[PDB]
Nucleic acid binder design. Structure first.
Lengths: 46, 208, 50, 99, 230
RNA sequence: GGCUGUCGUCAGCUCGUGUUGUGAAAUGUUGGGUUAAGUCCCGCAACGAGCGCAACCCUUAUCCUUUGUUGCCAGCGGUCC
């Protein structure tokens, strides 16, 4: 199947959904460093 | 209806108020009404965003809202696009100049209200209530709660005879006034009926 | 072909630090070693540090 | 003379406000009267706590409105105006009155 | 022990910023010691207020541009980092700058409170060119010492602030240039005494006798560890 | 669901690990003392923990510092007392 652009990032908790919107992808501007998330882009059954 | 409300008993000591303004007997009721309205609106809007505490504070004919939320990104959206939108509606609701601030909630597993909400959501999407409760308790413990209790009640597993079940872990002193007991509640509007979720989270004792 | 095409443009602002490389126009290479305070600099009698 | 009536529900907050006001006064002008505490209004409410019936079941709440009377004896040019730009903390209704 | 003690005899102000100060009388050989010690302390460790967080409305990041202005937003943040403020009572204040209309935006256009004093009424910040353009920034002025930069103040800040507040580096020290001279003192019975002529150059916000008093207290309380304990 | 009364503001109710019993279960939590109190001591196949029993809070009873009007008048001057 195809991969997906959603914030509903798995295993990883309330440390994924943060510098992004409710539909995924980094929300612009911000003081991002290393280990952050910019574009939620993960598939089920991968 | 045995127990006193844990927030309510502690407002003078360890817990603060949400609405934080002065008004004379003339304008007080109106203010309260406004607060109720705005809060209601906010809840409606930011349901998908994990929101814990709306703190209203109005000085000098201008309303200052402070939204405590776990994920600011979904409440803010694009930088100053969603917040701005919210603001004008808030102002309209009030009838004064509005100002929205957004506090970022560190550790949403330790915030009680948020946990409750999560539990409710889980219930709605047809999980085993017990497993959800366990998760709630465990997570909080992991995060560094001195203790947590959660309680769920009524039509559990769609059963005809309603009952309440509750899981405690650590220590949750309610009679002790100086204990920081974050209490809050929620309601799962399931197919069989409502399921009320209470949760107490003991952060620790304050010394003063 | 390509489906999801999201390009994100970061902008780091790098200052200067022990280990960078500076040079004049004459071939005088250098790795900036110590970032001294203002006080420890050699000041002339007018008062300005170098 | 400028009489100033501070009113608030939180006492600590009120105290803080009063101090601030004094500070504002004292740098610009001279001879601030002082932060005089008036009587607190303890407006009491009883309510039935049952949804339906149980009359002896009751909660008794109250709102403690605190009063802080600050007076300024000499209004100068610099002093009075300083307050216009100097707003106090929220939840503290101030009430200045010259003469 | 035939020593003496010095006093601040004459304090001349050459201007509002550049101002010398004498010290009299110093003992033989002490002049370069006190002068170099007061130089190191007066250049390292003085408290002065500076710009820390700038909040412009309708902005995303500091590398954007704005409607109706000349300087870009990095230029505005640099010109705000050069600002010289002098608060009296509080240690953390919030100013306001609101201005519309064609013409430059001086520092004298900030709607001051009572206890803040902006000592440079010709400090330029913006050059508003459109008459339909506006700018409403809200500055935050802390108070400290030394140099604390944006990288270290990226996680150090505890008070969870909201997103949209541009972080400006903090140049806290209001002393920029200091030189001392050991002349020959004019003592009517002694010839082996000297004076110390400290020539400060401030940010305009610090009072030189107050600066010298604070540097002297810093040196004395540092030497108390040698005096009391061993 | 929420909220409420109730036994009853009654000293009780429990859990973990360990132990005994085929087991339902028991121990802990019982026993000498003690207390308002499963309050505290001592022993004891129990060891620990939590909710509760207490305390933290409000009010009130004594004192101090601060600050004194629209509050007070001890000492002072005036007086229409």
């Amino acid at each position: 199947g195809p991969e997906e652009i959603t914030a509903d990032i798995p295993n990883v908790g309330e440390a994924a959904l943060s510098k992004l919107d409710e539909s995924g992808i980094v929300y612009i501007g911000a003081e991002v460093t290393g280990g952050d998330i910019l574009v939620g882009k993960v598939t089920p059954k991968g | 209806g045995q127990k006193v409300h844990p927030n309510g008993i502690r407002l003078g000591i360890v817990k603060p108020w949400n609405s934080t303004w002065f008004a004379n007997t003339k304008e007080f009721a109106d203010n309260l009404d406004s607060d109720f309205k705005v809060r209601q609106y906010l809840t409606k809007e930011l349901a998908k965003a994990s929101v814990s505490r709306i703190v209203i504070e109005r000085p000098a004919k201008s309303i200052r809202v402070t939204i405590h939320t776990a994920r600011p990104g979904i409440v803010i959206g694009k930088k100053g696009e969603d917040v701005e939108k919210l603001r004008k509606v808030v102002a309209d609701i009030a009838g004064v100049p509005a100002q929205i601030n957004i506090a970022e909630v560190r550790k949403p597993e330790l915030d009680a209200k948020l946990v409750a909400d999560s539990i409710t959501s889980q219930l709605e999407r047809r999980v085993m209530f017990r497993r959800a409760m366990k998760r709630a308790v465990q997570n909080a413990m992991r995060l560094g709660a001195k203790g947590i209790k959660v309680e769920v009640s009524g039509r559990l597993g769609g059963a005809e005879i309603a009952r309440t079940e509750w899981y405690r872990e650590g220590r949750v002193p309610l009679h002790t006034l100086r204990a920081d007991i974050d209490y809050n509640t929620s309601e799962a509007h399931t197919t069989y009926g409502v399921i009320g979720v209470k949760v107490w989270i003991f952060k620790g004792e304050i010394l003063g | 072909g390509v489906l999801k095409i999201v390009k994100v443009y970061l902008a780091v602002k790098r200052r200067i630090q022990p280990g960078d490389k500076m040079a004049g126009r004459h071939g005088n290479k250098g790795v900036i070693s110590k970032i001294n305070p203002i006080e420890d600099m050699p000041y002339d009698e007018n008062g300005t540090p170098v | 003379r400028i009489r100033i009536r501070l009113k608030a529900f939180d006492h600590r907050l009120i105290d803080q406000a009063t101090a601030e006001i004094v500070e504002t006064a004292k740098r610009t002008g001279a001879q601030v009267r002082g932060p005089i505490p008036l009587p607190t209004r303890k407006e009491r409410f009883t309510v039935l706590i049952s949804p339906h019936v149980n009359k002896d079941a009751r909660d008794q709440y109250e709102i403690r409105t605190h009063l802080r009377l600050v007076d300024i004896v000499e209004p100068t040019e610099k002093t009075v105006d300083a307050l216009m730009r100097l707003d106090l903390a929220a939840g503290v209704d101030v009430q200045i009155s010259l003469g | 022990t035939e020593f003496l003690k010095p006093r601040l005899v004459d304090i001349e102000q050459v201007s509002s910023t550049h101002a010398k100060v004498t010290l009299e009388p110093l003992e033989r050989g002490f002049g370069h010691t006190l002068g170099n010690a007061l130089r190191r302390i007066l250049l390292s460790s003085m408290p002065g207020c500076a710009v820390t967080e700038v909040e412009i409305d309708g902005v995303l990041h500091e590398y954007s541009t704005k409607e109706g202005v000349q300087e870009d937003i990095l230029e505005i943040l640099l010109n705000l980092k050069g600002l010289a403020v002098r608060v009296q009572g509080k240690d953390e204040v919030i100013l306001t700058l609101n201005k519309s209309g064609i013409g430059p935006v001086t520092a004298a256009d900030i709607t001051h409170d009572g206890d803040v004093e902006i000592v440079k009424p010709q400090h330029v910040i913006c050059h508003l060119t459109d008459e339909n353009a506006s700018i409403s920034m809200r500055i935050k002025v802390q108070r400290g010492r030394g140099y604390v930069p944006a990288s270290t103040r990226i996680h150090s800040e505890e008070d969870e602030r909201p997103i949209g507040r541009l972080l400006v580096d903090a140049c806290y020290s209001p002393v920029e240039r200091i030189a001392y001279n050991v002349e020959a003192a004019r003592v009517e019975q002694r010839t082996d005494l000297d004076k110390l002529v400290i020539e400060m150059e401030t940010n305009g916000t610090i009072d030189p006798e107050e600066a010298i008093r604070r540097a002297a207290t810093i040196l004395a309380e540092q030497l108390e560890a040698f005096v009391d304990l061993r």
